[PDB]
Design a protein around this ligand. Structure first.
Ligand SMILES: [Zn+2]
Ligand SMILES: [Zn+2]
Lengths: 96, 49, 277, 114, 48, 97, 209
């Protein structure tokens, strides 16, 4: 409804993309923290992550909570078809 | 250039088996259609534009 | 923001809405309906009817949005579109209290006592790209932000002797011509720099190239949290700028050397250089 | 603003100036057919380029099975309660997230932005 | 391939192949980068 | 030296790379000799001052006697001598160590 | 305009009063910090149709060690300079018995006058500058270390201490901005003093060739 106001040095599209990334990145982090604070002392993932032998704290959340958001060329998945990403969606769908 | 700055870009064509570029109106006339009311109806399909 | 706009390059076609070539054989004809008022209040003060009056007119419309954002109004434009091109043109204009900003131009009639229509179209197509309103020619877009890191902050030593960091506005451009940007007012001539080193070589010297090259190597190495000792950077950026000028480490740079004949034969031009030898 | 074709050899009529009655004359450069100009303006150049695409979208787009539909916004000219909306899908995409609608009733073709 | 023959000569100067001095002392200090480690000054940061 | 450091390091950091560690060498000597940090010590301060001077003399990087070879030596071991003088001062080694 | 023009002429003047102070000439103290409004009141408010004509700006200075060797600086009036125009100056030096001279070129010079200055080699040495380059002191930049020119008695002490020749030093061509700022000729040695993070201070030498 044309209720967005661009920020200095930002097109209307790029301001929208930047905010949609912030909402989605915080969910990957907040869900990730949920996956950790529920682990146990006997867990074997935490045992290889804590001692630093192999792994990272994001693989735990990707295995347990959420894989996250993919992106090619450093930006969201492009419109490979015309105004679509796959023939299963309707045109100009910008959802997550 | 202080000459074509005003007129603008010119549509060109590079036909096969020839060395030099050719303007499109020339190759249009080589098929007949010498008039410029008949050429500009094969290229523009509505004259309210 | 004002020095931002004063540094950025701005041409004419960025501040115009539309232009039209009309035909007024008399300045009182006023083919378009409503411009008669201001052109007439000029006309009761009629000056410069020296040779003729050119029947060919050029009318330009401006966008106050793009006008005020750079703090421009058509007065300065009006003198510089005259002062800078000659006096073959003549500009009368509105008052900005009127919502739309139009200024009309005719050729200097001294020429009428090669067609003037194609000449006027050439001039129209030439002024909107070669305007040079403000700024330096090559720098196109200039951003603005204040950092939060201690990398670009202003660290001062207070009176009691403690290191205090301060947030200060910095500007970053896309395009380089530093010798002019340094010469401007209210721009720090000490800490301003460019990420191209041939420019610093021509402008600042040779030792400045040494230090800038060292700094850029350090910044690209320590980007992902890694670390490399200092002696290696120093030795590299010292042997790279030892013979006075910037010789790149490439096939050409190795060729121009004081080394013997049996080393340049190990590089792809054995026979000719050895025949020379 | 338009264009003028000669009435004899069907070519492009150029504008010319006569020093007698101060009137624009359109001349040919193959023959010399003549006539006067009614609007007395030649060149116009729109740089704002704020053309509303309500004059460029076609009414048969409502036959597309790959476009979203709506029951909220009804048509005004006919009262149909089903529309199909989309975006500019053209250039001038700096702040271009408007939403043009088209009525889907057969033989209405009414278009409107909001 | 560029820097093959730079080395430390017996008077502690870093010379090229044609004996063109490059540094009057290695790394401007004279020490090998193998027996050094991180420390703190503890004199510049505090207040007066 | 405090005023010279503030112009060598303008930003204000303190992490530098240097020769032999000093805090660890003090910690070692505090245990090879069973130093009890509870009783008064017997280390005369003018002994600390003159010992640090004599030690600073025997750290030659550029060995020479004439000028232009006696100032390059002071330029080479400039930072390490500052660190050594600030760490082994008479107050600190009678208060902490 | 003239406000831009009265500003530049004060700025360019303040730069030169340091450039000649670096070369070891005698410049009075308050001439170094001559503020703008003081300059505007002394030489004139505006050079546009004004008293400052780009002449009445010239400077003549004498060396510290010797009152005889003097240096002059000229501010030509035309944008680009011709042939006899410098001979006008060459005559002005011929009459006053001064060999050290500078010319602050306004916008450029002709390939003509480029030939006309490289000829008088053994006498009447002149330095050609540009109006733009003198607008800022590059010596006070951040990246530029401190240079000092060594007498010809000190240079023979290096090559006898480090047992060097003069071919084995690092080189610098006499065409870069700091080689001209100090007025350096081939065969001289300049000393650079920069602070480093491993030692604290490091002194390097350059041969100008
Ligand atoms: Zn015709
Ligand atoms: Zn309808």
């Amino acid at each position: 409804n044309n209720e967005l106001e661009p920020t200095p040095g930002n097109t209307l599209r790029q301001t929208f993309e930047n905010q949609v990334n912030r909402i989605l990145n915080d969910a990957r982090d907040k869900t990730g923290s949920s996956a950790q604070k529920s682990l146990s002392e006997y867990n074997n993932f935490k045992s290889m992550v804590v001692s630093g032998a192999k792994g990272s704290k994001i693989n735990i959340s990707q295995v347990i909570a959420v894989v996250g958001q993919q992106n090619v060329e450093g930006k969201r998945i492009p419109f490979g078809f015309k105004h679509r990403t796959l023939p299963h969606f309707i045109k100009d769908d910008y959802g997550p | 250039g202080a000459k074509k700055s005003a007129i603008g870009q010119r549509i060109v064509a590079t036909l096969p088996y020839i060395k030099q570029e050719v303007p499109i109106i020339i190759v249009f006339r080589a098929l007949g259609f010498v008039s410029d009311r008949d050429i500009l109806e094969h290229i523009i399909y509505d004259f309210e534009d | 923001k004002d020095i931002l706009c004063r540094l950025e390059h701005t041409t004419l076609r960025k501040v115009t809405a539309n232009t039209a070539i009309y035909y007024d054989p008399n300045p009182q004809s006023t083919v378009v309906a409503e411009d008669q008022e201001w052109v007439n209040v000029y006309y009761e003060m009629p000056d410069f009817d020296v040779a003729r009056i050119s029947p060919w007119l050029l009318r330009v419309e401006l966008d106050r949005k793009h006008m005020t954002d750079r703090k421009l109004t058509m007065e300065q434009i009006a003198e510089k579109i005259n002062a800078g091109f000659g006096d073959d043109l003549n500009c009368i204009f509105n008052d900005d209290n009127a919502e739309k900003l139009v200024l009309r131009i005719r050729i200097m009639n001294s020429d009428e006592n090669m067609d003037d229509d194609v000449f006027l179209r050439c001039i129209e197509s030439n002024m909107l790209t070669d305007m040079t309103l403000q700024g330096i020619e090559q720098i196109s877009k200039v951003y603005m932000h204040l950092p939060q890191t201690d990398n670009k902050k202003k660290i001062i030593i207070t009176e009691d002797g403690e290191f205090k960091a301060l947030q200060e506005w910095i500007l970053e451009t896309d395009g380089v011509s530093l010798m002019r940007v340094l010469s401007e007012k209210d721009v720090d001539p000490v800490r301003t720099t460019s990420n191209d080193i041939v420019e610093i070589f021509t402008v600042l010297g040779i030792e400045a190239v040494r230090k800038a090259l060292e700094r850029e190597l350090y910044h690209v190495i320590s980007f992902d949290g890694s670390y490399v000792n200092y002696r290696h950077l120093a030795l590299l950026c010292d042997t790279m700028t030892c013979r006075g000028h910037l010789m790149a480490i490439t096939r050409h740079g190795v060729n121009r050397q004081d080394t013997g004949p049996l080393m340049k034969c190990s590089f792809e031009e054995t026979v000719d250089v050895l025949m020379e030898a | 603003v338009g264009i003028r074709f000669c009435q004899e050899c069907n070519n492009m009529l150029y504008p010319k100036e006569d020093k007698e009655n101060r009137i624009l004359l359109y001349a040919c450069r193959n023959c010399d057919y003549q006539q006067e100009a009614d609007n007395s303006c030649i060149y116009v150049n729109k740089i704002t380029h704020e053309v509303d695409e309500l004059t460029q979208i076609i009414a048969d787009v409502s036959q597309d099975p790959t476009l979203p539909r709506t029951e909220d916004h009804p048509c005004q000219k006919c009262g149909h309660k089903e529309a199909v909306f989309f975006q500019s899908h053209s250039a001038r995409a700096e702040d271009a997230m408007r939403l043009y609608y088209v009525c889907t009733a057969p033989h209405c073709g009414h278009r409107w932005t909001e | 391939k560029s820097m093959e023959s730079v080395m430390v000569k017996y008077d502690a100067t870093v010379r090229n192949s044609i004996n063109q001095v490059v540094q009057l002392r290695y790394g401007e200090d004279g020490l090998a980068g193998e027996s050094v480690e991180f420390q703190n000054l503890a004199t510049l940061k505090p207040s007066n | 030296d405090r005023e010279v450091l503030r112009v060598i390091f303008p930003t204000g950091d303190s992490k530098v790379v240097l020769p032999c560690n000093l805090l660890r060498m003090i910690w070692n000597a505090q245990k090879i000799f069973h130093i009890n940090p509870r009783l008064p010590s017997d280390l005369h301060p003018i002994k600390v001052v003159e010992g640090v001077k004599e030690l600073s003399k025997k750290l030659v990087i550029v060995n020479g006697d004439d000028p232009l070879s006696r100032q390059a030596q002071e330029n080479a071991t400039l930072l390490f001598n500052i660190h050594l003088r600030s760490t082994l001062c008479s107050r600190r080694m009678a208060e902490e160590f | 305009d003239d406000e831009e023009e009265t500003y530049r002429l004060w700025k360019i003047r303040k730069t030169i009063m340091q450039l000649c102070h670096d070369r070891g000439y005698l410049v009075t103290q308050d001439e170094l910090d001559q503020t703008l409004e003081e300059f505007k009141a002394q030489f004139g408010d505006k050079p546009s149709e004004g008293r400052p004509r780009r002449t009445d700006l010239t400077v003549l200075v004498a060396h510290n060690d010797d009152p005889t060797d003097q240096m002059f600086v000229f501010f030509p009036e035309e944008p680009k300079v011709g042939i006899k125009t410098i001979k006008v100056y060459c005559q002005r030096m011929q009459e006053e018995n001064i060999t050290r001279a500078l010319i602050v070129v306004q916008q450029g010079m002709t390939p003509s006058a480029k030939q006309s200055l490289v000829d008088m080699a053994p006498k009447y040495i002149l330095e050609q500058f540009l109006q733009q380059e003198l607008l800022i002191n590059i010596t006070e930049h951040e990246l530029v270390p401190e240079h000092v020119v060594m007498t010809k008695e000190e240079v023979t002490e290096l090559l006898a201490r480090y047992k060097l020749r003069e071919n084995q030093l690092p080189r610098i061509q006499a065409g870069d901005p700091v080689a001209r700022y100090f007025g350096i000729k081939r065969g001289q040695v300049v000393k650079i003093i920069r602070p480093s993070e491993t030692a604290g201070r490091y002194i390097t030498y350059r041969l100008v060739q």
